Design a protein around this ligand. Sequence first.
Ligand SMILES: [Ca+2]
Ligand SMILES: [Mg+2]
Ligand SMILES: [Mg+2]
Ligand SMILES: [Mg+2]
Length: 846
Amino acid sequence: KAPPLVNLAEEKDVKVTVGENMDLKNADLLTDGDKYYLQHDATGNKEGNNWENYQEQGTEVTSTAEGKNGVWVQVDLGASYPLEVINLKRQVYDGQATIGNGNPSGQGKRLKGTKISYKNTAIVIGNEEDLSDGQIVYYEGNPTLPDGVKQPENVSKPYEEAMGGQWFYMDYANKNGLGATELGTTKEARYIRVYTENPKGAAVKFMELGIYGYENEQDVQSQDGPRRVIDNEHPMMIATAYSNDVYEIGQEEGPELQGSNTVDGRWNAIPDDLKENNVLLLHTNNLRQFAPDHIGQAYLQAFHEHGLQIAYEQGAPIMLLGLTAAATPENGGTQYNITADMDYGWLDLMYRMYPNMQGVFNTENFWAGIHPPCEGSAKMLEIADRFGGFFVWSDQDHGSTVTNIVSNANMKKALEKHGDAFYLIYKNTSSNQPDDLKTSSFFQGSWLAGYTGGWGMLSDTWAWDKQFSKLWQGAGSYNNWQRLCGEPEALLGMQMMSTYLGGGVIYTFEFPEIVYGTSNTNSPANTHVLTELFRYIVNHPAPSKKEIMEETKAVLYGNVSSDFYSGLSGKPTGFQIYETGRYGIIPVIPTWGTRAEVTKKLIQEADKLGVTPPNVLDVKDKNLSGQAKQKYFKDLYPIEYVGNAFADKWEGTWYLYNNKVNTNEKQHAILPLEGEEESARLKVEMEPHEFMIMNESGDGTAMDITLNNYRVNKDEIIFDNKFGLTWTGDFSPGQTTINGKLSVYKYMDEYNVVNAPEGKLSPEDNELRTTTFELTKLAKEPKVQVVKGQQPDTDGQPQYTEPKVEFNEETGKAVITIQTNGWVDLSITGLEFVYDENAQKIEDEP
Ligand SMILES: [Ca+2]
Ligand SMILES: [Mg+2]
Ligand SMILES: [Mg+2]
Ligand SMILES: [Mg+2]
C-alpha cells in the first residue's frame, strides 16, 4: 500500500536530458533512490573489523564547451504532478573522505575531508519542455535561466554539500525555497531542471534528485488539526519497539525487534478497543552504533522508513526516537546512537509521507551533553507541531533537568511557540536517587501553569535492579539482568493509578519484552495488569487541568528538596507511589522564568479555566520547612480517611493501594461512606502489591469493588536460576545479543507464558493473598458475589477463592474475606447502615 506522497523521480518512467555541449554518463544513478552507495550491507557494513569507506557514485554531467563549466540536468516525469519537496545531493567530498575520530574519542567515527560548496545552483520547474513557463524553486549565483524565466530579486548564497543533500520547498518567500512549508504546499510540474557549477572543473556528479509529489490533486494532503489528541479524555500508552541491532538495507522481512517481536506483531497484539489510545516508538537501539556519517544516516533512515511503512499498512501510529545520549547532528553532539546522523529534511519528509507518523521521543541526553540535545529538540519540536504532531521528553529531574531545557534560547523560544505539543514524563530508572516524587511535581507543575500540553510516566523495571532481588530481599550479588525481572506486576498498576489521579495522560513501561511481551505475545504484566487498568483509564477520564487547578490551594516554585514529601504525601521510594492522596502530587513549577513570571503565567491559566488562582510559594518559604510544613498543608487540605494505606477519592470513586515496595506488611484504610448514615465505615486491609477501585451506589445499599494484586514469583526461576540460564553482560560466540537479554527473552518465551501451550510453563502466580473488608454498622448480613474474576492459565489453578462473609448480630460488623492473585470485580448488596456511636473519627492526631 503506497502512501500519498511518493518520490515521483523514482516511481515514474523518467527521461533524463542535459543541455547543448554536455555529456551525460550513468543517467540511472540520479533516480535509483540511493544517496550512499554502500557495498557491505551483508557484513554489518564492515570489511573485517573496519567500517567500509564512503565511495561516492552518481550521474556525471560534463561541459564540453570551452571556458564554460556550468551544466544542467533535466528530469521529465512524463506528466504534470503536484510537487511538494525536492532533495538534491551532489558529490560531497573533493577526493575520498577518510574515517577518523569522533565523540567520544576512540569509539565514535566521523568522515574527514574537504567538502564542496557548489555555485550557480538553481532549480526551475514547469510544464513546457523548454521551461519557457519556468518557476524558480531555488536560485544562487548568476546561472543563465531559460528564455521567459526572470531572475528573482532575492538570491541565495552557496552552502556546503551534506551527506543527506539539500531540501527545497515550493514557497520562494520562505527562505528562498529552503524554508519548510505547510503540508500540501504544491506546484504542478512535469519538467525539473537543476543548474550547477563545480568550483574546480567542468564535471558535476549528481548522486540523487528526489522529487516528492502526488499522483493527482485529489491525493494532496492538508493538516486539519492535530494527528492525535493527548489529554485526560484521550490518554496514550507508548510501547517501545527496540531494534535487535540486526538490519540489512534491502532485506525483505520487517526490522527484527528485541525478543523476536515485529512492528506489525506488537500492533496486532493490542485489543481493538485500545488501538486508538496506543502508539509504537521505533528505537534504533545500538544498530550500527558509532558508525561514520554515510552508514549511520543510511541505517537511521532505512530502519525508520521500513518501520513506518509496515505501521502504515497496519494503521499503527508511530513515534521515532529523535535523540538519546546527546547523539545529534548539532555542534557538540556524540555518536552514541545513529540519531547523530539525523537529517531534519528527512524528518520533515517522514511527516509529509506517512500520515501515521505522529511523535518524536527524547530521553537520557543530559549525562552526555546539555545544549546540543536542546538545539536538536528545539528543531524537532518545531517540525512536530508544524504537522500537528507531538514531542515527549522522558527524564528524572535531580533539580536542573527542566532548568537546563529552558536555559537554551532556541528550546525556550520553541516551547513558547509549540509548548502545547510538548509532554514531560518521569523515568525512575535511577530508583536509588529519591527524585521520583519531585520529578512528578515538576512535570505536573509545568502542565498546570500552561507551559506544556501534559505530563505522564515511564516506569522502568531497572528501578528494581538498583534496590531489590527476590521478593522482600535487597539487591545481593545477582546479575543485573536477573534483578530486571523481579518487579511485582501489580506495582506497575499502583504507579499508573498514581499518575492518573494527578491528571497524567501518557503511560510508558520498560523493559518492553517483560512489561509488554516477547514473540508477538502479551506478557503476564500486560494481560492481567496494564491492559485492564488502561481500559479503565480510557473509559473514566483523569482529572482535567480545570479539576486539578480547582483542588490546588498552593503551588511551589524552585528546586524542591527530595525529602519535602516525608511527613506529607510519603517518603520518596524511587517507585513513584504515595502514602496518601490527601495532598495530590503537589505541583512545583520549575525555572520556566522568575517567580514573578511563573506567577503571572499560573494566575492567567486559572483565569482561562474559570477557577480561583492558587497561592505561589518559593520552596524556601518558612511555611514549607521540616517543622512548619505539616501544619500548613493539614490546614489547607482536610483528611479524607484514616490509615497507613494509600487512598484518594476522585469523582465519587475511592482508589487505594498498599504502598510497601518490598517489605511484607499489611496496611489498612478506613473510609467514611456516602448515604443518609454518616457513621457508616468501610475498613480495607491489604498485603503488598495490591490496588483497589471502589464505587458506592450512593443510596447507601450497595458497593462495587475491583481489586488487583497480580504478582508472579521469580524467586526460583530467575534468582535460584532453576533452568540454568546464562545471566551475564557478555556475548556468546556468533551471537548479536548478550546472554542476559537472551535469558530474559527465553524466560518470557518458555517459563512465564499466558495460556501456556504444551511444553511451556504457566506464570508462577498461584500463591493467593488475603484482602479483608469490615463494614459497620449494619442491621443484617450483606450479600457479596464475584461478578467477574481472573480465570486460570492452562495449569487450571484458580487466581481467587469465593468470598467468605461473617456477620456479628451483636456489633453489626460484617467481615468479608477473599484470597486473590490477580483481579476480581466484587458486588456487595443488601447494605442497611444504622447509627454507630463508635464509628472511627475521620480526623488528624492531636
Ligand atoms: Ca542515486
Ligand atoms: Mg496556554
Ligand atoms: Mg458511585
Ligand atoms: Mg495461575
